[PDB]
From a paper:
Instead, individual domains and domain combinations were investigated structurally and for possible interdomain interactions.
Xyl bears two family 36 carbohydrate binding modules (CBM) sharing 84% sequence identity. CD spectroscopy revealed CBM36-1 to be folded at 20°C and to retain its fold up to 80°C. CBM36-2, however, was only partly folded at 20°C and completely unfolded at 30°C. CBM36-1 was crystallised in 0.1 M Hepes pH 7.5 and 25% PEG 3000. CBM36-1 consists of 10 β-strands and a short α-helix between the first two β-strands. Eight β-strands form two 4-stranded, antiparallel β-sheets creating a jellyroll structure. Metal ion site 1 or Ca2+-1 is adjacent to the sole α-helix, while Ca2+-2 is in a depression at one end of the jellyroll. Ca2+-1 is coordinated by main chain carbonyl oxygen atoms of Gly286 and Asp376, and the side chains of Gln267, Glu269 and Asp376, whereas Ca2+-2 is coordinated by carbonyl groups of Tyr291 and Trp371, and side chains of Asp367 and Asp 372. The pocket is lined with aromatic residues including Tyr277, Tyr293 and Trp371 for substrate binding.
Residue numbers in the entry: 262 to 385
The structure:
């Protein structure tokens, strides 16, 4: 009923997307359009999405959730300590869907560190 996809296993995109080791094994998104994405098979259309990550500092980091090219919501991190952020009851298509995690709100004040994406609901 839950599946976890490590961000470091996803396909990198953008200018500077890179791997990090601390505060967890994961990926850093440093600027706008820095992203990771992968193909998620879905047998049904409604899931909760939880991203574990954090800012690199005390400023608020944000990561956008995209599915099938549609922006479905934004994960927010109010500091540098690793935390989960859940976006509940996201509707989306079935079959193979491209899940994208992308920075769009960078302004030179923070980087987004992302550990894993957890998807909850009706068969992991
Ligand atoms: Ca940045
Ligand atoms: Ca990870």
């Amino acid at each position: 009923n839950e599946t976890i996809v490590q961000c470091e296993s996803m396909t990198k995109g953008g200018q500077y997307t890179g791997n990090i080791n601390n505060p967890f094994g994961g990926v850093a998104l440093y600027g706008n359009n820095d992203k990771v994405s992968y193909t998620q098979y879905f047998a049904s259309g409604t899931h909760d999405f939880t991203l574990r990550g954090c800012s690199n500092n005390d400023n608020m980091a944000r990561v956008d959730l995209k599915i099938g090219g549609e922006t479905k919501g934004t994960f927010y991190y109010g500091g540098s300590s690793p935390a989960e952020y859940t976006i509940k009851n996201v509707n989306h298509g079935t079959g193979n869907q491209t899940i994208e995690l992308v920075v769009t709100a960078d302004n030179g004040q923070w980087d987004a560190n992302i550990d894993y994406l957890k998807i909850g609901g009706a068969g992991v």
